[PDB]
């Protein structure tokens, strides 16, 4: 498995932000992250490239479609320094 | 000198404006001391120069002449590990080295715990030099950097000097020094001792493991013999890394080596070596190839008999690889011979390879002194007039026979007995075979078997025979045999005379019982019977001979064997087995031939691993230039078509500069011949 996959699994239960290949940003609490980067998310606030913002309850996006994630700074401590 | 003769001590002064005699006098002075050091060959009045092996070594490793003669005397047959360092220290390049008072404390600490003892003492610079050498082998970096500067000098020039000493001893043929020196050279190269395990020179082998093996007090052969990886980890008592260690072991050189010696004659002794290489290759660790020095040394390990460097390439590892060489013996060692000679293989790089297999002499009994060939009497008087029918005299396009052919002619052309005609390439064996054939025809016999192993010269000889021999007897059918057993059988019937290689005619004659034509063959010419020595084919050709003799005895048949061959020392025995008599046998020496021929053999260095080198090429061009400037015509032989092309372009380059590119003919004539 990937070390960043391992971190991303640690990120479960936290509030993360996600940018997809389309450019829409989904901020919310990450329920579940599979090995394939498929992520289940809660109470998501979404900002579109046009600037419009919406709210949704439960969202699940495919791994392949995710440009990148931003995860909280708490995890930066360890154990990935090694 | 020209500018100021008396300043630089020219006595000649007014005499010799060009200082011819001054130059020549300096050369004289140089070549005396060089000759004393056996660097070059020189003679005062005749004035001929040539380079020796020691001189070549000094040239290669750029040893000063003083260092050179120091090596010459100080190295000895019995010199040991302690003396080797001393000699190294004595090397003239260290004359400028001297002990220092700030160096002296560390020196004092060293020389107590130094493994290799020192015959000299702290005040003497030589002792400082070889203790620095020891430190270098043992990997000691230093705080006080005066010592460290000196040891840098030793670092850069040490492997050089040691390697030179080793080559010198190898030329001398000394057994005790050469092995230890080879170990030292290896230690300068790889920076370690023998007691430090060879796993150190692997880049990937870890530190804890090598410490553990150093401290474990175990023979190296045992670790090498261990196979099971888990069992290796248990043996090295750390479970971790064991698999890695075993992988690296199979990457360490391991040889199952065998040698079968065998005498060619009493003086010359040939050794057939079987060298197997079990290790697995790596381009990173091993490099391009593996040079391995093969030493043939006596039963003591005192003096070297014979040596060669051999390259083990990636292709050879694991194959069953035979290596052959010859050695001439001594007079006393010839008379009484030892129980065995030692054959030892050492890696120029890898540590503690040390594969020594005894070369077994147990009841090896040498044969008798070589018997001389039958003498050449003085008679020329035999000629084409002696033979009976004058239709056979229009054949040879000459009248008087040769000196060697005149000797054999009486037993050959007159009687019908079994003749060993024998020797020489230049003296026509073709002609003597022709005479034998004529004698055979003369008696109304008609079946003739001419057997030469060289299939291309068979065809030439057929072309010459069919146009002339066949028509004079007037009916006789001369043929060459083809690949088919059926076709060469039908030829065996149709044709009076058959020409074939030993393989062909042995294959056809294998059923003599079933083919009754072969039971009836009256006369045979075995041409070039000296090629029975040649590989398996010679064995085929003696199978054919033996079969024919067995047929003669079994069928009570009178079969005339004419054995044509080259000069052979064991020839008379060979004729004896063929149903011959000492009077019928004629063996001559190679010197008996009628065109005195100088065999000039010239030996060059580092050529064993190559087809030719550039000095060989130059010398060949020089010889060719001598012949071409003379009226003589000359030819050069080469291993391949590729090699011929390379040498051709090379020759053209040599010629274009010098006066002679000459074809001894105009440039406009040659294109009409080569139009194709």
């Amino acid at each position: 498995n990937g070390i960043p996959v391992k971190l991303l699994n640690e990120a479960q239960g936290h509030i993360v932000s996600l940018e997809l290949t389309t450019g829409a940003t989904y901020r919310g609490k990450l329920v579940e992250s599979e090995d394939s980067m498929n992520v289940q998310l809660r109470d998501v606030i979404a900002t579109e490239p046009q600037g419009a913002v919406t709210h949704m309850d439960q969202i699940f996006v495919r791994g392949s479609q995710i440009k990148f994630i931003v995860v909280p700074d708490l995890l930066k401590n360890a154990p990935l320094f090694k | 000198m020209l500018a100021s003769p008396m300043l630089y001590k020219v006595p000649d002064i007014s005499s010799d404006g060009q200082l011819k005699k001054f130059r020549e006098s300096l050369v004289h002075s140089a070549l005396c001391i060089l000759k004393e050091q056996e660097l070059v060959l020189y003679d005062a009045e005749n004035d001929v120069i040539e380079a020796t092996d020691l001189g070549n070594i000094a040239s290669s490793f750029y040893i000063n002449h003083a260092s050179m003669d120091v090596y010459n005397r100080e190295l000895d047959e019995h010199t040991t590990q302690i003396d080797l360092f001393r000699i190294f220290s004595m090397s003239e390049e260290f004359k400028y080295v001297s002990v220092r008072y700030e160096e002296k404390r560390e020196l004092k600490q060293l020389l107590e715990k130094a493994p290799i003892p020192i015959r000299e003492d702290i005040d003497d610079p030589l002792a400082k030099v070889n203790v620095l050498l020891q430190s270098y082998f043992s990997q000691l970096k230093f705080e006080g950097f005066a010592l460290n500067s000196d040891i840098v000098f030793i670092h850069q020039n040490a492997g050089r000097l040691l390697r030179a000493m080793f080559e010198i001893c190898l030329k001398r043929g000394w057994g005790h020094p050469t092995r230890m020196l080879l170990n030292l050279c290896k230690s300068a190269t790889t920076k370690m001792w023998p007691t430090n395990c060879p796993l150190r020179q692997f880049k990937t082998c870890p530190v804890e493991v090598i410490k553990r093996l150093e401290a474990s007090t175990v023979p190296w052969g045992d670790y090498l013999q261990l196979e099971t990886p888990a069992e290796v980890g248990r043996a090295i008592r750390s479970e971790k890394y064991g698999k890695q260690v075993y992988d690296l072991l199979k990457r360490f050189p391991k040889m199952s080596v065998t040698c079968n010696a065998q005498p060619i004659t009493r003086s010359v002794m040939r050794f057939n070596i079987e060298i197997i290489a079990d290790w697995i290759w790596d381009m990173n660790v091993h490099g391009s190839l593996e040079p391995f020095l093969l030493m043939l040394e006596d039963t003591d390990g005192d003096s070297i008999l014979y040596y060669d460097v051999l390259f083990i390439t990636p292709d050879i590892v694991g194959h069953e690889f035979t290596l052959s060489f010859t050695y001439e013996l001594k007079q006393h060692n010839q008379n009484n011979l030892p129980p065995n000679f030692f054959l030892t293989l050492i890696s120029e790089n890898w540590w503690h390879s040390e594969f020594e297999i005894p070369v077994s002499f147990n009841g090896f009994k040498l044969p008798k002194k070589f018997p001389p060939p039958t003498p050449l009497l003085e008679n020329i008087s035999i000629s084409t007039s002696e033979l009976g029918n004058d239709d056979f005299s229009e054949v040879f396009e000459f009248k008087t026979f040769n000196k060697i052919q005149s000797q054999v002619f009486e037993s050959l052309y007159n009687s019908n007995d079994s003749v060993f005609v024998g020797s020489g390439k230049g003296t026509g064996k073709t002609a003597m075979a022709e005479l034998a054939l004529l004698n055979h025809w003369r008696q109304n016999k008609g079946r003739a078997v001419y057997i030469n192993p060289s299939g291309e010269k068979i065809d030439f000889l057929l072309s010459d025979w069919n146009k002339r021999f066949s028509h004079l007897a007037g009916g006789k059918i001369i043929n060459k045999l083809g690949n088919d057993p059926s076709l060469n059988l039908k030829l065996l019937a149709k044709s009076h005379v058959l020409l074939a290689t030993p393989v062909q005619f042995e294959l056809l004659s294998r059923r003599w019982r079933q083919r009754k034509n072969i039971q009836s063959l009256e006369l045979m010419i075995y041409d070039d019977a000296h090629e029975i020595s040649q590989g398996v084919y010679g064995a085929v050709y003696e199978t054919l001979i033996s079969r024919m003799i067995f047929i003669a005895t079994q069928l009570e048949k009178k079969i005339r064997f004419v054995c044509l061959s080259n000069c052979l020392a064991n020839a008379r025995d060979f004729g004896e087995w063929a149903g011959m008599t000492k009077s019928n046998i004629y063996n001559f020496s190679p010197s008996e031939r009628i065109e005195p021929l100088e065999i000039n053999i010239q030996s060059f260095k580092d050529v064993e691993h190559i087809s030719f080198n550039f000095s060989m090429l130059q010398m060949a061009f020089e010889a060719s230039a001598a012949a071409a400037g003379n009226r003589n015509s000359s030819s050069v032989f080469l291993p391949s078509r590729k090699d011929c092309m390379e040498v051709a372009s090379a020759f053209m380059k040599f010629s274009k500069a010098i006066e002679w590119d000459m074809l001894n003919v105009e440039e406009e004539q040659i294109v009409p011949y080569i139009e194709k």
Binding site: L7, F68, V70 | -
Partner: protein
């Protein structure tokens, strides 16, 4: 890529956006984790502080040595 570890690196994305951050770890897919990562778009103009980010290896074009590690 292991030498680049802990360094400040500049990664160029597939869309042309420029990200800059400390390279803490990678993987086979070249998915990178970037600490204290900020985004620049046009060249400073339109710079944003993202923080700790993963980037996908499918989106990454190239990376260059920006500055020394903290």
């Amino acid at each position: 890529l292991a030498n680049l570890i802990d360094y400040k690196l500049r990664v160029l994305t597939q869309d042309g956006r420029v990200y800059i951050g400390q390279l803490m770890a990678f993987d086979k897919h070249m998915n990178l984790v970037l600490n204290e990562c900020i985004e620049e778009r046009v060249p400073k103009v339109e710079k944003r502080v993202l923080g700790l980010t993963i980037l996908r290896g499918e989106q990454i074009l190239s990376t260059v040595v920006e500055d020394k590690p903290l």
